[PDB]
Design a protein around this ligand. Structure first.
Ligand SMILES: Cc1ccc(SCCC(=O)Oc2ccc(S(N)(=O)=O)cc2)cc1
Ligand SMILES: [Zn+2]
Length: 257
């Protein structure tokens, strides 16, 4: 029902999701002259088990890679967190051209895409459903993707898209550690925010990597060739799924560096 087209897009989400106009909405423009270095931030620690990788799904507006989350095989710790967060999913956002596509921006610069690695607070809550609406419920790592050299670490993900071309298609997607997609440096910014699409819950502690990762023009073309329509309908390419940046409304972006 909600989407990214003119009628059902970001500008219209506030009609059924009034939190769209809230005080902790994501994404944001990170102004580096306004970040506050925080001495208490610990290094980010990711430990993911490739056997937790489950399924790749065409969800119409995007594609998701889902992980088994019945236990602490795949966790995020450190950074601003006291709690351990359990991996559940990673996905991407992209734009209609190389010029835009990231959700977060840095000093107003727009990258070509962004990787989200999402986790839920299994220290406090017993399920993703319980965690998702809680202020301390979710932790998402964002990595800005800069158009340039082809990124070989995307190969398994890109190779899998031919089997989920249309909306609702899904396939097994196994034996994959998404920490291989992260940049060498885990230097980061953090700020309290939200899911970047409906239902836009203000439940996310964002970890934005300072270092970008690469993606080629042709790798981005593979994302944009995914189809939003169900099989047999006329083809409607997934051209974009990035939400514009939202007002900080007095929030502080902290730097680990
Ligand atoms: C109908 C319904 C009800 C609850 C939710 S909430 C749990 C899934 C979630 O958390 O899904 C997302 C995770 C990360 C991001 S993002 N782009 O990284 O902010 C978005 C959705 C979703 C749909
Ligand atoms: Zn996302």
């Amino acid at each position: 029902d909600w989407g990214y087209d003119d009628k059902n897009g970001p500008e219209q989400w506030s009609k059924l999701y009034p939190i769209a106009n809230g005080n902790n909405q994501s994404p944001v423009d990170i102004k580096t002259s306004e970040t506050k270095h925080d001495t208490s931030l610990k290094p980010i620690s990711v430990s993911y088990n490739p056997a937790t990788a489950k399924e790749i799904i065409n969800v119409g507006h995007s594609f998701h890679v889902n992980f088994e989350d019945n236990d602490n095989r795949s966790v995020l710790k450190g950074g601003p967190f006291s709690d351990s967060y359990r991996l559940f999913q990673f996905h991407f956002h992209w734009g209609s051209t190389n010029e835009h596509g990231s959700e977060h921006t840095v000093d107003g610069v727009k990258y070509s895409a962004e990787l989200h690695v999402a986790h839920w607070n299994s220290a406090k809550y017993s399920s993703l459903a319980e965690a998702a609406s809680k202020a301390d419920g979710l932790a998402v790592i964002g990595v800005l993707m800069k158009v340039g050299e082809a990124n070989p670490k995307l190969q398994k993900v890109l190779d899998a898209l031919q089997a989920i071309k249309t909306k609702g298609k899904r396939a097994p997607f196994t034996n994959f550690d998404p920490s291989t997609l992260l940049p060498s440096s885990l230097d980061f910014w953090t700020y309290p925010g939200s899911l970047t699409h409906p239902p836009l819950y203000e439940s996310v502690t964002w970890i934005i990597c300072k270092e970008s990762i690469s993606v080629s023009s042709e790798q981005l073309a593979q994302f944009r060739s995914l189809l939003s329509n169900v099989e047999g309908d006329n083809a409607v390419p997934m051209q974009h799924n990035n939400r514009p940046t939202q007002p900080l409304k007095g929030r502080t972006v902290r730097a680990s560096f």
